[PDB]
């Protein structure tokens, strides 16, 4: 047991002798669960599952638990589950799941991941003729606010060509919860989990979800079939992070965000990939701060996942859908993976994108011999080509034949 | 009788009384005045009072009357004003009787219950209908500067919709406004309308909980089962408001100011306004920007979390150029699903076009275009002035939305 | 009865048990003033009214009320007031005021301010024709350090008839005192009372000074009478305001200011407006921190009053005076005022003067053929009418029709 | 023995006294280690390497020694190694490890700089041809994304001349130390000793594993022998040295950084260079804050560019802006202007294409471009080979005096 002695806004601290770091009480007049981040030598920072309603000074704990577990298994597919690991759904009878795992598990050995060699057929365009992903290969989407993140993921999902699907939404609108099951249909969400927390819920329901998904998509790997793992916006689990640890004693280092983020955020984004037995393939949705690339929570995504997708809003204002850029996005294992053909092509049509990118302003202003520079002569000449290949529609999924037919017949 | 207050000053006071609730009030009991437990200690607690702060003394004592704030809310409540406490403003009337007691804070509908939006909610503004498009159930913003265009969009908006109630939370604006928005609206909208006002002046918690009062009487006439027009203008007074409460209740400083609280309590406040299993919400908020850059702190969070954003610039209202939306900069993220596809088709070609022009238009003035090297500039040229007596619209107008349709498809050929 | 325990520079504190806030002290050997903002279970923080120097610690102070009121009356009129409510002027007798007035009242109620829909003319044919006044408009005249500010409500002294001027010189030049005493007629001076506290004075005396302006000004207005207050540099009240209160120790909000400037600001600016019994019509100087609008006490004032004349610096170094940048300005009764066709005048106007600001760049260097767009050959026609219209000399006033009569000449 | 005060996310504060600063601590039951940052009067500041959870007040601290030394071994050969020297894989027994050192030592001084021959034979015929190293000169690869270095590095570590080869792979990816363990052959593999750490692994040691790999190419530097030693991605050290000084505290003074790592980093690599007992011969990379911070610092930058990787020209090398301080120290004279010639015959190439596009091409005078395109053909099959074309010295150099022909 012990006193509960001050009460802040997201942060509880109490007096507890020799309490361990994530061990969870409950609190005794009323049911609800906390869970201990912080040591003081006699004062515990605990981090409650709820709101704080009526919590008064004195008031009693009691030991629950050693180390917070969620409860697994196979009965787990077509259902809804939140970020703390409970059934969301209440329409449906209740599962039963015969194993429990912790949330926090270690990488795969690096001397026995394998060699990404496969592509991941995944329906957009650009995605597939321009910058291809590989089963095992963890990408990453970079924009800013409402500038298509969580369209590109539509497009994904629902032309997706993986065996198991674990859609994760982190932090994000309940309003959209129905959208993504909207495009869903029953041939690919019979084998799909959905681990959503809105962002009305506490801090760390909302800070942990990433790890239940993670630790389901482990699961669904170490049965041995390879999975797609998909979170919309980690970058809520950095800021629900942020919230947490800095309210706890522990200083702003670059961006308000404290050293636990920057430690426990490569930990959450590698222990995805290949695996001695499957793999996890990731798609990690990241939400910049503004629209700078001196983003502290976004550059070390950039740089510690293999293929960055920067979407641009300077592309969306031209109505120009999916606004991704070229010149900034790149997948690292495309010289992996792909034929040397396709290699060439994909390369030769972004040599046209940038050179029209900035050509056409001697055609506007009228400077402008044709014959002299061949390269601009054939960018221009396949301008509306190339437009039509790289932006599409919502709903037009495509398979990795007809990218590859109509790269080849862009680039000719 | 129970504790003392031991420190006045700034915003908040501090006591010393022990075994506290969080969030319960108390009376300061010579002087009939009370203030809310906001956070706890072990001894001293932090205490929000209600009114001004001035006058008070160490060891003034400090009585105790309830576990939680709540408000009066009843079916007697429309075509009335209310202040942010609860309380009615207006005092020539005889005060109704409003039965029913709630809570000022409460839970979201549960998000496999909310459906899919599909039907479109006429505004009569025909850029924001033909090129952007609201649905009933959504809950949209209006991102701009100091004064340049939101009260006067919002006071089109309401001089346009229609909805079984309307509440408009006129929380952290200036009082000339209450007569202002009192004269645009008919007498058939105030028959169904219910005004929570908070001028500038009032203190930190008024100005802070009249946004939860405003969404406590929508969320009320929701329940009945009647689609509820809530419009909320200011958003960002509440943030202000929260911002200086929780940094004088001793908390840290991320993103440019504003505590952690305030952008945890923004989605408590504004996913409430939605669909649900019966009736529905369409909030609109407005949001005002610290410089006109729309990348501020709470523009761009409110930006993500809203479901749609009218972003207003002030380079369009130096040109008269009124409503001063700027098109390629906003976008309704629910049109896709509540109407059909000449529409949304032809909405894309026309703010292609306006993009177009956007960028021709500088080498236009200093002097260097030159017609007939690209075809779509041309077109963009062609059509411009025809495109906007559609896109900009007297003050005094409301359009119909089948007007809308016809005209753009018009403009668009 | 309590003693002084440090000085801290601007503010002192000291050991006064059990202290009323706002109540005001006397240092008790040496005659000066002092008063609470803040305690700390015993210890008052106390904002002297005087100079520091002198001071030591174990110093006494003796109570004097619970309020520092001024006192007021009707024999205020053609005089002058110091700061904090006193005569300055030693020449002449001390007059002789019947009631007392605290400096912080409410505004008044919002049900009864009635709409303000009658013209105030002011003299200046750009605040007649192109933005008009309402009697009860707040306004605000936005510019940079010496752009025109002082010299443009030198010529709104003598061209707006009301029936009391209650004008503020917080925070600025001692020399100034003599220039506004030479523009005011006596038919003027002998309704004009001139409240003036100059940048010398301690940071109450600056801070408290707009306060004393607005409690004369609602003396003059509950009496029946139309006022016109006026305001210097209402950003001299928000800097003594940020250095009281971050010396106090509050937090750095935005842009350099506290939380409570930004909150007491609104409750000085919001008392001036329409009123049940007679009305205060106010126009508050603002200086920016550079020529940019967007200083945070200039975005904060400009998203408070009821109308913004924004001067630019470079309209004076283009000799182009009075500086007032048509495009920035507006005035947010306008329509409530003018006829119909008075504001489709002045929105010709202002088109025309937008669309020379576009074509100017044509027509200088060559390329704008006489004849092409059927609106810059209007404005190019009509830019040296609308020029000598815009600007005014300081000593030429204008009347109402006369302005209308030439903005309907010119725009058409 | 020392227990534990409380833990503050990262920042472990124990109360024992008469401690050091970077004496690495121990837990007694977990057998975790955390190392000192900073001391109280008889309070000490100290990080751990491993995790947090499951630390409570009152755990005892092994004080372990005073500074944490790597056991080096001729017996490291042709086996893995983490950032601390402890190995890889629990799959084959450690061998015998009989000498210990420290992470730490005393450089010579700046001023004693000597002069450097001896050429170093290195593999691909591009800058063995043009821009010819010697056993001293420290090299820094600069070489963005999308750009084959990691093909470029292994194929160097082939027929490179070293007797021992020693690679610190740093902060990386999981599988790009398969991917690249895959290109290098058993004849390599039974030569090296190679540090890798990824990023799941704490800053401490994946700044340790700097040292780590420098203090065991220092000690097969004593042996009499020649040693090569890799760093991929410097950058990587430079943002994990700044991780371990921002959560120590530190203000930032250029970019985030700290001035800790501007004080390590000239202390990283200004030694191991060109030691009379044997030499030690270093190729750092940096990605395109610090890049002119090293280009200033060592002697010889090789640039890569993916622009140039746009076409199929592997290696990505560009001639026109990678230099080498110190060949005419190492290579004779008749060499040296061959390869200038070579340098200014490829540098005037894109100074005579641009104008092949507007139609004003003339002949009459082109004298470091009218021999250039005639005799591109050998250019582009020289400095353009394989990924297993390894071209002995003799060689090169005739092929190169056949190219200026
Ligand atoms: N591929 C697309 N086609 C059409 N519209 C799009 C596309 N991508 C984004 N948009 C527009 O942008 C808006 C917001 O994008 P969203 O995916 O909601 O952003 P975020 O995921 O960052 O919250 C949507 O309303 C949508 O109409
Ligand atoms: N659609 C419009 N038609 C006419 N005038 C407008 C329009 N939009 C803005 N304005 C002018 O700009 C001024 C400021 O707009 P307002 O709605 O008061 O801004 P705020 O967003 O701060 O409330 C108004 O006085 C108005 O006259
Ligand atoms: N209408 C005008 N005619 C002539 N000079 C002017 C006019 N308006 C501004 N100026 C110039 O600007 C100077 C300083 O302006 P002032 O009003 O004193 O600046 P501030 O805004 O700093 O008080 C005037 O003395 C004058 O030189
Ligand atoms: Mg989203
Ligand atoms: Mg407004
Ligand atoms: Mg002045």
Same mark, same amino acid.
């Given at each position: 047991?012990?006193?509960?002695?001050?009460?802040?806004?997201? %942060?509880?601290?109490?007096?507890?002798?020799?309490? *361990?770091?994530?061990?969870?009480?409950?609190?005794?007049?009323?049911?609800?669960?906390?869970?201990?981040?912080?040591?003081?030598?006699?004062?515990?920072?605990?981090?409650?599952? &709820?709101?704080? !309603?009526?919590?008064?000074?004195?008031?009693?704990?009691?030991?629950?638990?050693?180390?917070?577990?969620?409860?697994?298994? +196979?009965?787990?597919?077509? *259902?809804?589950? +939140?970020?703390?690991?409970?059934?969301?759904? !209440?329409?449906?009878?209740?599962?039963?799941?015969?194993?429990?795992?912790?949330?926090?598990?270690?990488?795969?050995?690096?001397?026995? *991941?394998?060699?990404?060699?496969?592509?991941?057929?995944? $329906?957009?365009?650009?995605?597939?003729?321009?910058?291809?992903?590989?089963?095992?290969?963890? %990408?990453?989407?970079?924009? #800013?606010?409402?500038?298509?993140?969580?369209?590109?993921?539509?497009? %994904?999902?629902?032309?997706?060509?993986?065996?198991?699907?674990?859609?994760?939404?982190? $932090?994000?609108?309940?309003?959209?919860?129905?959208?993504?099951?909207?495009?869903?249909?029953?041939?690919?969400?019979?084998?799909?989990?959905?681990?959503?927390?809105?962002?009305?819920?506490?801090?760390? &329901? *909302?800070?942990?979800?990433?790890?239940?998904?993670? =630790?389901?998509?482990?699961?669904?790997?170490?049965?041995?079939?390879?999975?797609?793992?998909?979170?919309?916006?980690?970058?809520? /689990?950095?800021?629900?992070?942020?919230?947490?640890?800095?309210?706890?004693?522990?200083?702003?280092?670059?961006? #308000?965000?404290?050293?636990?983020?920057? !430690?426990?955020?490569?930990?959450?984004?590698?222990?995805?990939?290949?695996?001695?037995?499957? !793999?996890?393939?990731?798609?990690?949705?990241?939400?910049?701060?503004?629209?700078?690339?001196? +983003?502290?929570?976004?550059?070390?995504?950039?740089?510690?996942?293999?293929?960055?997708?920067?979407?641009?809003?300077?592309?969306?204002?031209?109505?120009?859908?999916?606004?991704?850029?070229? $010149?900034?996005?790149?997948?690292?294992?495309?010289?992996?993976?792909?034929?040397?053909?396709?290699?060439?092509?994909?390369?030769?049509?972004?040599?046209?994108?940038? =050179?029209?990118?900035?050509? &056409?302003?001697? %055609?506007?202003?009228?400077? /402008?011999?044709?014959?002299?520079?061949? @390269?601009?002569?054939?960018?221009?000449?396949?301008?509306?080509?190339?437009?039509?290949?790289?932006?599409?529609? =919502?709903?037009?999924?495509?398979?990795? @034949?007809? =990218?590859? @037919?109509?790269?080849?017949?862009?680039?000719?």
């Amino acid at each position: 047991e012990g006193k509960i002695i001050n009460i802040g806004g997201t %942060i509880i601290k109490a007096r507890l002798p020799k309490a *361990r770091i994530g061990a969870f009480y409950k609190i005794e007049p009323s049911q609800r669960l906390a869970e201990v981040i912080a040591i003081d030598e006699d004062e515990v920072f605990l981090l409650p599952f &709820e709101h704080v !309603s009526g919590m008064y000074c004195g008031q009693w704990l009691s030991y629950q638990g050693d180390e917070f577990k969620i409860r697994v298994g +196979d009965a787990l597919l077509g *259902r809804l589950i +939140d970020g703390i690991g409970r059934p969301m759904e !209440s329409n449906i009878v209740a599962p039963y799941l015969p194993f429990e795992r912790s949330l926090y598990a270690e990488p795969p050995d690096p001397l026995l *991941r394998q060699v990404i060699d496969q592509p991941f057929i995944l $329906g957009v365009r650009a995605i597939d003729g321009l910058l291809t992903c590989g089963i095992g290969q963890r %990408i990453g989407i970079f924009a #800013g606010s409402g500038v298509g993140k969580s369209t590109l993921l539509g497009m %994904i999902c629902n032309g997706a060509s993986a065996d198991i699907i674990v859609l994760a939404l982190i $932090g994000e609108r309940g309003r959209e919860v129905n959208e993504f099951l909207a495009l869903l249909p029953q041939s690919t969400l019979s084998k799909c989990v959905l681990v959503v927390t809105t962002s009305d819920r506490p801090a760390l &329901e *909302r800070m942990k979800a990433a790890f239940t998904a993670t =630790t389901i998509a482990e699961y669904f790997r170490d049965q041995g079939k390879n999975v797609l793992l998909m979170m919309d916006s980690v970058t809520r /689990y950095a800021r629900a992070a942020r919230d947490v640890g800095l309210a706890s004693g522990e200083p702003d280092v670059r961006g #308000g965000f404290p050293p636990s983020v920057f !430690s426990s955020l490569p930990k959450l984004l590698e222990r995805a990939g290949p695996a001695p037995k499957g !793999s996890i393939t990731a798609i990690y949705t990241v939400l910049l701060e503004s629209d700078n690339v001196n +983003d502290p929570i976004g550059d070390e995504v950039r740089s510690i996942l293999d293929g960055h997708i920067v979407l641009t809003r300077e592309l969306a204002e031209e109505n120009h859908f999916p606004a991704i850029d070229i $010149g900034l996005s790149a997948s690292r294992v495309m010289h992996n993976v792909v034929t040397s053909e396709h290699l060439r092509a994909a390369a030769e049509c972004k040599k046209l994108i940038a =050179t029209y990118k900035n050509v &056409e302003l001697l %055609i506007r202003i009228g400077e /402008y011999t044709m014959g002299q520079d061949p @390269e601009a002569d054939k960018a221009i000449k396949n301008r509306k080509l190339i437009q039509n290949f790289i932006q599409q529609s =919502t709903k037009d999924i495509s398979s990795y @034949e007809k =990218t590859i @037919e109509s790269l080849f017949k862009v680039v000719a």
